[PDB]
Amino acid sequence: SGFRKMAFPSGKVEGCMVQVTCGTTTLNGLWLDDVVYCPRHVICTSEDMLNPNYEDLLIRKSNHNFLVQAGNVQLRVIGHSMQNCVLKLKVDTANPKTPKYKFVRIQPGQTFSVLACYNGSPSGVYQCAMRPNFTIKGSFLNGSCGSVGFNIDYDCVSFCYMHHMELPTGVHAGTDLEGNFYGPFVDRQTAQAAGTDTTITVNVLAWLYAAVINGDRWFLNRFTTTLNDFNLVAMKYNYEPLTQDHVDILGPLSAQTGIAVLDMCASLKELLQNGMNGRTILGSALLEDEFTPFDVVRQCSGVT
């Protein structure tokens, strides 16, 4: 028993982290096979980060201007190309530590682990969710760019995120591994609206089921609701509308606990309307939305 904000074991990703330097800018890259992936803003100075013309900036760069270091050893760059907002530096050596991997573009509301890195060196690992508004609430300082987000299924690492920037609001934005930003964000130092964020309803319900499994049951009530009635409450509290697809994904947890999904929605409705009254659920005084139904089942079944 017990429920924690658990990250995937990071070893397979630690073996891919490298340092990429271009001019006076240093950030992290991801070395998979014979390619190193990093944010294209590695080619920017502070005088052009306000409005960079990446095509023009990259033209002034040659393979020898990209310094790639894996621990203490230097990699030889034999090709460079820009794909969307990422640079792909072809190197003459395949990473011997390359795990089985995929590049995936996650959906908003899905979770992943972030391995924060500085100068190609791992500093820490944490779990987070891609917000409905396509930002992440991470922990990133200057130099963390190029740190990646990922999920692991047995021996396969699915890379879903590469860190590119911190918005003036302090939230984080980045791309998939093809260099496509999540959300409307551009890699420019300009004011950028993230838009209204909402609470990931299906994840809050999944966490409520995790709470019941682990003994926190005070919030269970004698009520039920309908999807339409529940969604009227969800709209008022800036929660994502719950769909039958969400109810279907909650199926295993509903079956395990014997608590019908609409009954759990009624518990959530009462928690939204009444608050916690100074009580806690799984050590939290707020409704947690960073665990998907898959995460709750994985953590509750001990999947390795």
Ligand X SMILES: COc1ccc2nnn(CC(=O)N(Cc3ccccn3)c3ccc(C4CCNCC4)cc3)c2c1
85 is known as an active-site residue: no
Distance, in Å, from the CA atom of 107 to the CA atom of 245, rounded to the nearest integer, reads: 14
Residue numbers 9-28 binding ligand X by CB under 6 A = 25
Residue 24 or 228 with smaller CB distance to ligand X: 24
Which residues contact residue 303 at a Cβ distance below 8 angstroms, ignoring those fewer than 6 apart?
Answer: none
41 is known as an active-site residue: yes
Distance, in Å, from the CA atom of 210 to the CA atom of 281, rounded to the nearest integer, reads: 10
Closest contact distance (angstroms) between CB of 299 and ligand X is 13
CA-closest candidate to residue 68, choices 56, 59, 80 = 80
Supply the DSSP symbol for 224: -
Q: Among ligand X, a copy of itself, none, what binds residue 260 when CB lies within 5 to 8 Å by partner kind?
A: none
Residue numbers 209-228 binding a copy of itself by CB under 8 A = 214-215
Residue numbers 83-142 binding ligand X by CB under 6 A = 140-142
Q: Among ligand X, a copy of itself, none, what binds residue 244 when CB lies within 5 to 8 Å by partner kind?
A: none
Q: Among a copy of itself, ligand X, none, what binds residue 5 when CB lies within 5 to 8 Å by partner kind?
A: a copy of itself
| Amino acid symbol at 239 | Y
Report whether 104 contacts 158 (CB < 8 A).
Answer: yes
Report whether 183 contacts 135 (CB < 8 A).
Answer: yes
List active site positions: 41, 145
Residues binding a copy of itself (CB under 8 A): 1-12, 14-15, 115-119, 121-126, 128, 137-144, 166, 170-172, 214-215, 275-276, 278, 280, 283-286, 298-304
